[PDB]
Amino acid sequence: NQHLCGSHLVEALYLVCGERGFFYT
Amino acid sequence: GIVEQCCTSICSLYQLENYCN
Amino acid sequence: PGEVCPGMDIRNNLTRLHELENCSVIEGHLQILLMFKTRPEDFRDLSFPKLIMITDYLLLFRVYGLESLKDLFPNLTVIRGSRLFFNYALVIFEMVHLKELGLYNLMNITRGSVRIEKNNELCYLATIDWSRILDSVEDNHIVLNKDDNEECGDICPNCPATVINGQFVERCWTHSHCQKVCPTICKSHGCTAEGLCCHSECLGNCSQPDDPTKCVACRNFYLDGRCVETCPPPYYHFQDWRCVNFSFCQDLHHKCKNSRRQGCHQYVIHNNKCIPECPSGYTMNSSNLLCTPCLGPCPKVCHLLEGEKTIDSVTSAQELRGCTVINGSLIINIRGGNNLAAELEANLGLIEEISGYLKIRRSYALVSLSFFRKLRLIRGETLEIGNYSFYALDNQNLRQLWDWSKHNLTTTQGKLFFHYNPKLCLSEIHKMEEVSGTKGRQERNDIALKTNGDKASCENELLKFSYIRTSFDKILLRWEPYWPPDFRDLLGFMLFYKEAPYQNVTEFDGQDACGSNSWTVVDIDPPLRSNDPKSQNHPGWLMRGLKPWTQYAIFVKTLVTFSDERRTYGAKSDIIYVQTDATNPSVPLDPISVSNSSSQIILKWKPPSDPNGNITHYLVFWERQAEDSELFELDYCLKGLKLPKTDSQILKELEESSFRKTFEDYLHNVVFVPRPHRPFEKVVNKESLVISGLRHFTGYRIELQACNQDTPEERCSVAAYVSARTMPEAKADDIVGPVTHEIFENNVVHLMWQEPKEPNGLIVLYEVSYRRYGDEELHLCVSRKHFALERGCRLRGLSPGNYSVRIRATSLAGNGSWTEPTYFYVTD
Amino acid sequence: HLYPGEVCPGMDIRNNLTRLHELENCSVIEGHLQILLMFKTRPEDFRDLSFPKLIMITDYLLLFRVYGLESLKDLFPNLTVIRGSRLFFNYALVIFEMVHLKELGLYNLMNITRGSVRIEKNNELCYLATIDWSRILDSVEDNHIVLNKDDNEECGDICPCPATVINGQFVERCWTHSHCQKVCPTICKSHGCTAEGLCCHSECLGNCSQPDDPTKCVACRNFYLDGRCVETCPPPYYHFQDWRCVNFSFCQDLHHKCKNSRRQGCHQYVIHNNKCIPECPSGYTMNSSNLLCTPCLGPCPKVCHLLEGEKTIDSVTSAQELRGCTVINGSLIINIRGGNNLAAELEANLGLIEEISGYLKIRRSYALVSLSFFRKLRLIRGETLEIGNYSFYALDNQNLRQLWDWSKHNLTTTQGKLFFHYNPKLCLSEIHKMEEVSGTKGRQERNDIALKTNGDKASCENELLKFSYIRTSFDKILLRWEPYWPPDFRDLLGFMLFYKEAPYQNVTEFDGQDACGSNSWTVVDIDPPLRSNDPKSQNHPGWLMRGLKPWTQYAIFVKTLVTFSDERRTYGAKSDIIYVQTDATNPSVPLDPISVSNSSSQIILKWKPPSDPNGNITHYLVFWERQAEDSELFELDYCLKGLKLPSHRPFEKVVNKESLVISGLRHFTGYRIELQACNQDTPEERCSVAAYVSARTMPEAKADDIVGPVTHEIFENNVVHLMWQEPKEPNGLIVLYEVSYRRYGDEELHLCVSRKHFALERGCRLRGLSPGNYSVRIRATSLAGNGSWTEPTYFYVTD
DNA sequence: CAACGCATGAGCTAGATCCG
């Protein structure tokens, strides 16, 4: 749908980042 | 702000690849 | 005499009686009432001795100190009575100091009844013969006077008398005037002083006999100092007592076409009489004031009060009942009341045209202006200041102006005004100028762009129904899932349904109240979403409370919240008509069955309550119920015969959904950081049946079926049960043949006979009657069991000699006939 | 010991378990502690991870989207207080969207000091209706526990724990399957508690090791110093983060690290008033070397340099950062969504704002009640403005009521133009006094601040109207109020009067809401007073009420209705609500009267009070009257077709009863009785219409029975005479005498005799019987029933 | 000069200081 907000945002972002890990300062 | 550049408009996969290192 | 003058209505002063200085025949009604501060010394110098014939009535209601009427109205002769007061033509109620009635000269009150009450010093009421004054005597009401207890010595003078109810009392009005009577050869024209009768046209007194020019009260019609029975052309009848020409009836129509306050009665010419209004199905032509009949819907015509009339509630709308064409402006301000469903469409559902300018100022209870259902035009001759003709402010719930598919509005001049109408959308006030045509004669109207659309939506998408399945009593409704682009915003769905007679139901109609609705609103929670094109994500709802073979209307309406830019979304499906299936019907109600012959039954029933389809036919079985065999064992000659989602709940439930959206919108914002068998009969389309070919007096049992579809392996209902009897034949109970006697020596005799070969039901008793001619009779009941055991009857206790013996057999119907007198004789 | 571990700064744990190992021996976490975003984690490896010595966490605790935590009692067994200096969207513990949490398990938690808890969105969580939150954290309404597995009562919920009675039911409160919580007697509230109920030292929370010892406590309260608890620690030491006390050497050397600003999160801690405070507050400057605070020359404000030009106040996490700053160099929005009540905490941190150099904006805020928490606003300088040239601004504030108390507040906005829209409980009077005291006087728009949509749902008027004369009757009640005139004699559509029922004096005030409802007070319109041209006239207006019930209380108030205008006057007028009671009227009929017969003298009778009493019922009134039997039952022969078998005025002023006994009257006779209810009695006795019952008592046994020898007399014509006595009193009326005679072998043959034949034969005569010795047995039957026989007496003739 | 006589009480004739 390419309008990624709501509860799908935390799931769709995981599959594109499945091994690197999330980023923080 | 992820909820203002991927909810008020469309965002590309070049943009939300920045969030993961 | 004098001149005619209209009717007075005087109260609390005496200075208003000066206007009868020259009146002679006061057409209208004179009523003198409620004068309190008047002593009897104020009524001595007051007299109207030339008032002669008043037409409507008279009324004297609580005057004080009126000593007698013989000096106020001393020359009344005729009162007519066209318009009456409680159907009474002369009302004397509750005076004091009233000694004598004293209206000594009135002769023929035409129509009504006199009502004299409760005036505690009045006698000379018993000596007034109302048999020959008013023609319809039986409705007068003379109670609670001074003369319940007879105390006052009403002696009167030399004056003639008659009889009324067996008493030969004398007749007198006062102590110095007595009731004038005329002998019965000249009934109603009235006599002169010596007893000749007057002309054949006059009422009451006449001055000179056999001259119709000079009597004082014409009975039929007055015309120019003469007296005439039917006024010929070129004259016309008016108020059925005098005759005018055409010029005397025309000018006063224009002279009070403008009202001081009311009205005038605008006069028409119609069949030789000036009447106030023509009857139904007749309308005035404005050229020569002639009255012509109708074609189609007739105008009324409804003009209005001072150019503007305001409707606050139903009681304000009652003056505009049935009004078709309105010559002025109009304004609606409705707030509330009770039972507002169909009443605003009832009072003004036949309105045709409006000609001023229309104001929907301050109206809150309405939802739509569809209750101007027959309105075609707002032409607007007079204009609202600001060059307007259509004005609307303070419409907090108005949603729909008019349906531009089933209706065609037009207008010509003026301008429009739509401000502060939030629920009224913008595309629907863009949808009216194609039909009204203000893009023609093109003008710059003033409607603000931001003042409307709030709490409203018009960019809705179209929902398509997906699958439909009907049973005999349930229908499922699943459709395609609608999501706004932010799927947290959709609170849920709203479904609407109602029965429908045809395929013509519109979408927002007939509810039009504050907290009421014609539809049946039902809710359904939204489904879940799994980012999957094929999944279990199609929403659904089950409808249960249905009826067989009905046809409904259904549609889907979303309900979403608002982002903070006044940018809403939503959807609305089409109006889809759904129809159910057929079940077997119920039983035919309350069958009845009367007979009329020896072998016929007729039936009458009702069609069933729920037919559940087009009933093609009925089906009827009849079987025999032979005889109740336990009735065989009773001696019958011993005793006889055995046989709420309120508006505050909407806001607070929508706030809590926007509170849960806000927190998990904040949580993403700080945690992510980017990188830098029996026979049958078949009766069709009827409710009766004449059965034939039956046995007499045998009870039948009848079963009824109502069967709706026949050709594809028919099905129908539980049978309704009823019982019937046939009226028995009279001849079939007589004993066939002479009754045989057998003489034994020991004075018991055998009287045997044969039973009739076709009885009606059963033969239960026998009445045998032996009697010596010249001696008394002793009855004997022969039972069925005794005849069955003995094949006759053994009659004991019989002295010798000849006897006349009568035989009969009592069956369940009645008597048959006696036989011959059975002579068994021995020679003495 | 008290705090045996090492102090330990705040941590974030993401994507693995390897970063969790640096919490090995931490005992207090200043800062916050988050556990976020762990997807590749089986439930089997959290069984061997435990943090025993974690005791108190100062800011908050956030857990969001982890996989494999069945219950928290493996990780955090011993956290007793979470304190809440820095909240997280006004919550101090937030557990949001776990997938495998079964049990809460935080079984040792005692006191949440500042904040609230929000446990949201768990598809497996049970045991949430058994916590008794109102004792743990000191507020109770600000929580939010929805959308869980405990939305239904379906998790089992077995627990083998005081079972407290805080609510109205006897429910039991437990943490997990095998741990029940501790609520001990309530003499000392939060001062700690042992197992056997003995109270601890005053300066403790949670558990205790030994009672009354400030050395071996566990979760200390005010400050901390060298293994003790001191109420105010002495000035060899200073306060720090309101939990410690620390010496001079510590609060100085943190300057030397982040005076070289490698990161702008550090703060140069400077000593002020026995505190180690980061920025010394407004009106003070730091010196060069010695690091104290000295009084300023002139004013020196702490300019509060706001990033990016805007801020959006949402909760006490964002309104925490403006604490103590005085001159905002930007603009503030206010957007508080949902909310129960936030005016208690917004005052103490952003209520010292003096000058603001942008615009305000109060949009979409629901739970605002007044704008009074801004305390020292002096001037909105307004170098910038909004889109459309505005400085102040409002939208959709559904409960705003007051801008500022204008008796003692001054506000000068230099430039810019106001804006008001959709404030359904704000009057135009409070914004027009705003218009005169502000620096702007006549800079408006047309269309200006909205004149229609403000204050629609709340009525508010200023001048009062009093009442002058009230008269009262049993159905009508009359009003008269003193007149009123605006400066325009045409600016009056009249009045409107309201009257409603109220059985008690706690009736509300007029809300002003129009929702087509029953609380619209049944409005009666009043015609306007016609233009009198006279001071004393018939324009002292009143009305008359007609449809009243007697003896009830009504609530009446009166309000005018004028045309609003462009001129800033004629707000109207409105009286205060009073109460008037009408007098009484004749009561109703007594309802459901039953008469029950039990014996030959007692008759009982009951009823109910009437449906419409119309006053306090003083007494009832019962009259009865003896009906006599039918004379047509006196002169008929009664063994033909038909036999009968039925089933001054003495009064009493019965008072405060519902049943009545009447004894001592004649037997089997019928009485007509009538009863009335009756209100006030001694002046002008006024009772209702009566109600009628027919009553019949029960029969007596030995009335119709005859004793004594019957006597037989012998005539020569074999018509034998018989004498007996009629009974002296029967049960109503003797109707037949039944004589029977008997021989040996045959049955008994009987004979009718009634009253006429008994009178005309003087006994009974027997016609034509066989000679010998016949036994005679005699009964009498009345209309009530039968009697017994007599002794069978022999009458004998010999032939 | 401060309830009642010169009515009744929401049944085409007025409307509760509505009339002294």
Give one DSSP letter per residue of D424-470, joined into a string.
TT--HHHHHHHHHHSS-SS---SS-S-SSSSSTTS----B---B---
Residue C86 CA, nucleotide E11 C1', distance (Å):
12
Three-state SS at D20: helix
D16 vs A21: CB contact, 8 Å cut-off? yes
Residue given tokens 């200390």 in the structure block: D220
Element of type H or E holding C418 = strand C416-418
How far apart (Å, rounded) are the C-alpha atoms in residues C624 and C629? 14
How far apart (Å, rounded) are the C-alpha atoms in residues D645 and D728? 21
Give Cβ neighbours of residue C495 (< 8 Å, ≥ 6 apart): C477, C521, C522, C523, C524, C541, C554, C555, C556, C557
Nearest residue to nucleotide E16, by CA–C1' distance, is: D544
How far apart (Å, rounded) are the C-alpha atoms in residues D738 and D715? 22
Give the residue from D408, D412, D418, D355 showing the smallest Cα distance to D385.
Answer: D418
Q: For an interface test with A, which of D11, D14, D264 has the most A Cβ atoms less than 10 Å from its Cβ?
A: D14
Q: How far is C424 from chain D (nearest CA, A)?
A: 16
> Which residue in B3, B7, B20 is closest to A23 by CB distance?
B20
Give Cβ neighbours of residue C742 (< 8 Å, ≥ 6 apart): C749, C750, C751, C752, C792
Give Cβ neighbours of residue D776 (< 8 Å, ≥ 6 apart): D710, D712, D722, D739, D740, D741, D742, D792, D793, D794, D795
Q: Resolution in A, one decimal?
A: 4.3
Residue pair D32/D92 in contact by the 8 Å Cβ criterion: no
DSSP type of residue C794: E
Q: Residue D190 CB: number of other CB atoms within 10 A?
A: 15
Beta-strand relationship, C268-270 and C221-223: unpaired
Chains with at least 3 CB pairs less than 8 angstroms from chain D = A, C
Residue pair D29/D10 in contact by the 8 Å Cβ criterion: yes
Phi first, then psi, for residue C332 (nearest 5°) are -115, 125
> Which residue in B10, B16, B21 is closest to A13 by CB distance?
B16
Domain D312-449 has CATH 3.80.20.20: yes
C486 vs A3: CB contact, 8 Å cut-off? yes
B20 vs A2: CB contact, 8 Å cut-off? no
DSSP type of residue C203: -
Nearest nt to C86, CA vs C1'? E12
C666 vs D89: CB contact, 8 Å cut-off? yes
Q: Residue D326 CB: number of other CB atoms within 10 A?
A: 19
Please compute, for residue C625, the number of CA atoms within 13 A of its CA located in the half-sphere on the CB side: 13
How far apart (Å, rounded) are the C-alpha atoms in residues C686 and C607? 9
How far apart (Å, rounded) are the C-alpha atoms in residues C726 and C703? 17
Q: Residue C490 CB: number of other CB atoms within 10 A?
A: 21
Please compute, for residue C149, the number of CA atoms within 13 A of its CA located in the half-sphere on the CB side: 2
D65 vs A10: CB contact, 8 Å cut-off? yes
* Chain C interface includes D514 (CB < 8 A): yes
Q: Which CATH number fits domain D238-295: 3.40.1390.20, 2.10.220.10, 3.40.50.1820, 3.40.50.300?
A: 2.10.220.10
B19 vs C672: CB contact, 8 Å cut-off? yes
How far apart (Å, rounded) are the C-alpha atoms in residues C213 and C207? 10
Locate the DSSP E strands across C423-575.
446-447, 465-470, 475-479, 490-499, 520-524, 540-543, 551-560
Residue D455 corresponds to which tokens in the numbers above?
A: 């204050």
How far apart (Å, rounded) are the C-alpha atoms in residues D38 and D421? 47
CA nearest A25 in B: which residue?
B21
- Sorted by where each begins, the domain ranges of chain A are 1-25
Domain D467-581 has CATH 2.30.30.110: no
Residue pair C172/C157 in contact by the 8 Å Cβ criterion: yes
Residue C556 corresponds to which tokens in the numbers above?
A: 């889907």
- D163 torsion bin: left (phi>0), alpha (psi -120 to 50), beta (else): left
Three-state SS at C508: coil
> Which residue in A5, A12, A23 is closest to C486 by CB distance?
A5
Nearest residue to nucleotide E13, by CA–C1' distance, is: C33
Task: Give Cα separations from C506 to C502, C503, D102, D363 (angstroms).
Answer: 11, 9, 53, 39
Residue pair D237/D247 in contact by the 8 Å Cβ criterion: yes
Residue pair D143/D120 in contact by the 8 Å Cβ criterion: no
How far apart (Å, rounded) are the C-alpha atoms in residues D659 and D656? 10
Residue D475 CA, nucleotide E11 C1', distance (Å):
18
Give the residue from C813, C601, C591 showing the smallest Cα distance to C726.
Answer: C601
Task: Give Cα separations from A22 to B4, C157, D63 (angstroms).
Answer: 19, 133, 16
Task: Give Cα separations from C30 to C6, C22, C45, C171, C769 (angstroms).
Answer: 9, 15, 20, 28, 88
How far apart (Å, rounded) are the C-alpha atoms in residues D2 and D55? 10
- Residues recorded for chain B: 21
Give Cβ neighbours of residue D273 (< 8 Å, ≥ 6 apart): D293
Nearest nt to D471, CA vs C1'? E16
Three-state SS at D689: coil
Q: Which CATH number fits domain C310-447: 3.40.50.300, 3.10.20.30, 2.60.40.650, 3.80.20.20?
A: 3.80.20.20
Residue D500 corresponds to which tokens in the numbers above?
A: 């409603």
Q: How far is C564 from chain D (nearest CA, A)?
A: 9
**C236-293 has which CATH code?**
2.10.220.10
DSSP state letters, D85-123: SS-SSS-SEEEE--SS--B---TT--EE-SS-EEEE--S
Give the residue from D86, D143, D139 showing the smallest Cα distance to D111.
Answer: D139
Nucleotides of E under 7 A from a protein CB: 6-7, 10, 12-18
The topology (CATH level 3) of C465-579 is Immunoglobulin-like (2.60.40)
Give the residue from C476, C692, C482 showing the smallest Cα distance to C601.
Answer: C692
Residue pair D781/D735 in contact by the 8 Å Cβ criterion: yes
- Sign of CA pseudo-dihedral C618, C624, C627, C628: negative
Locate the DSSP E strands across D450-522.
471-472, 477-480, 495-501
Give the residue from C796, C805, C804 showing the smallest Cα distance to C753.
Answer: C805
Residue C56 corresponds to which tokens in the numbers above?
A: 């409507």
Q: How far is A2 from chain B (nearest CA, A)?
A: 6
Give the residue from D302, D231, D316 showing the smallest Cα distance to D270.
Answer: D302
